[PDB]
Ligand code: HEM
Ligand code: HEM
Ligand SMILES: N=C(NCCC[C@H](N)C(=O)N(O)[C@H]1CN[C@H](C(N)=O)C1)N[N+](=O)[O-]
Ligand SMILES: N=C(NCCC[C@H](N)C(=O)N(O)[C@H]1CN[C@H](C(N)=O)C1)N[N+](=O)[O-]
């Protein structure tokens with residue numbers, strides 16, 4: 001009932017009760033753990049709304065107040081009629097902040113309460129959506145001094161009027177398959193890079209071509225838009241020692257902005273809710289650059305370093321990986337674009353966990369995602385036991401629109 | 408109920424049916440995952456059924472399920488159990504059982520070698536001196552002058568729980584740890600408590616940074632006894648770097664034989680409380696954990712300085728840079744001295760092949776992602792991108808409480 005989690009490097013022991021309020025499933029059973037698997041009605045709605053409102057009023061110290069009871073009845077009535085409801089502004093903001101607060105896979109949640117929320121619920125067209133996104137991108141980039149934000153479009157109604165941003169992130173590089181059979185640019189987007197062309201986008205066919213937004217409003221077919229370039233902050237990648245590094249032709253965008261997730265608050269579903277914070281170095285340096293199925297640039301860099309790539313045991317992949325990541329961090333800093341190294345980010349997460357345990361009674365966390373993709377055990381989270389469970393409001397995965405859209 | 412796991416780097420999908428045979432608990436529920444938690448006297452009543460499942464698996468493995476030999480064995484064990492409340496395993500069953508405990512070890516990345524285990528049957532052992540003799544032979548056999556061979560030695564099973572055989576050491580070979588009055592620690596911090604017990608038991612500690620600990624052996628539930636492993640039997644490797652000549656000056660070395668000796672081996676319901684086993688090291692165990700854990704030898708800084716890395720701010724990745732070099736050193740030193748060792752790229756690639764093979768030939772392979780993925784360069788090793796299913800099968804290796812916490816001293 002009252003689970004404890006221990007940190008094996010510092011012996012700190014925290015007790016977890018927050019998990020008792022958990023409501024969603026985890027994919028695991030008492031017979032099998034699926035901790036490493038990537039993707040594990042009016043009657044339905046009111047209970048959800050109630051749990052939320054109750055947690056909402058409890059958060060503002062007005063639990064079981066008239067205001068509390070009143071709104072509960074008000075929403076209660078609204079659902080009974082409209083078979084749905086609308087969140088006050090205060091509720092939309094509390095919900096969004098808490099969905100981030102409950103993202104068990106996010107290592108940067110110590111920043112959760114500073115989220116800037118942009119209410120785009122009055123939006124109606126792909127052009128409108130495009131307007132809101134440009135504003136989000138500009139506000140968040142803030143000339144390199146990034147500020148976390150999320151833009152919330154209209155919630156779901158009948159599922160036949162869903163707003164969706166087809167991109168997986170507001171900003172990503174295109175990927176094209178060549179005659180060579182090889183892939184030019186980012187392989188993970190190869191497909192999307194095609195559905196944009198299956199729409200008319202004139203691809204420059206380069207290594208780092210910023211994709212076009214493909215926005216879908218109220219259910220209609222998506223429309224293409226090109227983000228103003230001066231709004232897309234980019235960082236050329238160089239090394240604080242290897243002058244040859246620049247010759248590699250590497251660069252990345254400064255604003256990470258997940259756009260394909262679904263935000264759930266009080267039972268309400270927001271299918272278009274792009275959000276952004278700022279990068280942890282490793283996301284680019286380790287995953288985007290060195291994943292074999294991504295830009296897969298380990299060999300090249302190893303070559304330039306003239307390393308003995310004859311035997312895995314020389315750890316050339318490892319050496320190169322380190323340099324590369326020193327280069328991503330170095331560049332961003334040099335250009336004054338916000339970025340955090342894995343050591344600093346993981347240290348924050350530990351402090352955040354301690355804060356969350358003593359102020360909220362716990363912190364859902366997914367060890368598999370929290371531990372950085374490099375130097376695992378030299379970061380504190382590696383030695384930190386974590387309990388994973390699902391709390392709401394939350395951010396969830398959802399089918400790619402192009403596998404559900406009735407054109 | 409079939410379950411699939413996908414590898415996101417190769418899109419290869421596998422189906423798991425083996426998990427259906429799982430009976431033990433994981434520690435998780437439909438509402439919470441405890442996948443990252445370190446540690447999530449049977450009666451006649453519960454014993455025979457456990458014996459049967461095991462004998463059923465054993466006889467199926469040899470293609471004699473339902474034979475007369477199979478039926479008579481069940482009968483023989485059953486009778487023996489009602490007759491003595493317990494039962495003895497045949498040699499073949501023991502070998503089979505030990506191999507499967509290894510094969511079922513979800514946290515082990517080296518399982519591609521499971522079928523080659525050398526099993527030493529020490530069930531006829533009665534005293535600590537006898538235990539010492541078996542262990543010495545295990546260490547010499549397994550070490551094989553640097554060409555390591557996996558092996559396990561199995562002492563008498565538990566009976567009433569008051570006559571347990573136990574090896575008090577956590578590994579047959581480990582370095583002493585000494586807490587100094589100024590609060591600093593000399594040697595391996597991980598073994599401070601055990602080292603104190605040894606000194607208290609009479610060990611004359613040399614108080615250096617790498618003193619091989621004595622064996623503290625308990626036979627038949629009696630008070631444990633100290634023994635020194637013949638030095639000529641303990642293979643060690645001086646650590647040096649293939650480019651940094653000053654590395655050798657750090658005075659680092661490690662033993663070549665990793666031999667866990669505090670786990671409990673369960674087979675057909677029987678419990679073997681003393682079952683030391685050994686294989687060979689994967690570089691990162693020493694390079695990343697033993698040397699760089701803040702709570703172990705903690706050498707990142709000293710190595711960092713020597714390299715003249717910018718240690719002013721973490722974003723210089725000086726820790727990460729030093730880490731790779733130290734791990735290069737460990738691998739280099741072992742290969743030069745021709746002492747078996749495997750890097751994480753190589754070891755993890757083997758595990759993926761082993762895993763695929765297991766799904767196809769056995770219907771699954773329980774695996775703990777949290778432990779399989781190496782402590783450095785996680786995502787550049789294939790296991791990071793590999794989905795895994797963790798569940799408990801027997802025979803198995805289990806944790807058991809430290810004996811100094813449960814032992815009734817006799818004096
Ligand atoms: C401001 C600093 C932030 C940092 C440094 C940070 C860092 C990270 C990292 C390292 C991951 C894993 C990325 C991956 O491997 O794909 C992640 C995941 C995630 N973060 Fe954060 N984050 C931040 C802000 C945000 C914000 C503003 C939100 C939402 C409001 C958020 C929501 C999430 C979610 C839901 C995931 C998991 C997404 C998935 O399952 O793919 N993060 N974050
Ligand atoms: C052939 C060489 C082998 C390699 C390279 C290998 C490698 C490893 C590694 C890297 C771990 C994790 C250790 C840690 O982080 O503390 C591990 C765990 C484990 N291995 Fe193996 N292993 C091998 C042989 C064996 C053998 C012979 C057995 C038993 C017959 C075995 C049983 C286990 C068990 C039970 C665990 C988990 C122990 C625990 O939870 O503390 N391994 N192995
Ligand atoms: N720092 C942040 N990182 C999140 C987005 C960038 C990440 N590297 C990525 O490509 N992803 O998170 C995406 C690719 N794989 C993920 C999945 N579920 O399959 C989503 N966020 N943020 O600050 O708002
Ligand atoms: N290559 C092998 N490695 C296993 C033993 C060495 C390991 N580095 C270690 O110190 N440990 O596994 C011990 C310290 N931490 C573990 C724990 N549960 O707390 C036990 N095995 N083998 O070849 O048989």
Ligand SMILES: C[C@H](O)[C@H](O)[C@H]1CNc2nc(N)[nH]c(=O)c2N1
Pocket residue numbers: 035036037038368369370415791792793794795
């Ligand atoms: C199969 C495995 O779950 C998968 O590779 C996970 C592991 N941990 C991760 N952790 C983070 N932060 N991001 C990821 O994409 C992943 N991928």
Ligand SMILES: C[C@H](O)[C@H](O)[C@H]1CNc2nc(N)[nH]c(=O)c2N1
Pocket residue numbers: 008382383384385386443444445777778779
């Ligand atoms: C808290 C966390 O479960 C713990 O530190 C685990 C993580 N993964 C590990 N993996 C291996 N191989 N060995 C370990 O000791 C650990 N420690």
Ligand SMILES: [Zn+2]
Pocket residue numbers: 028029032033034035435439440441442
């Ligand atoms: Zn689980």
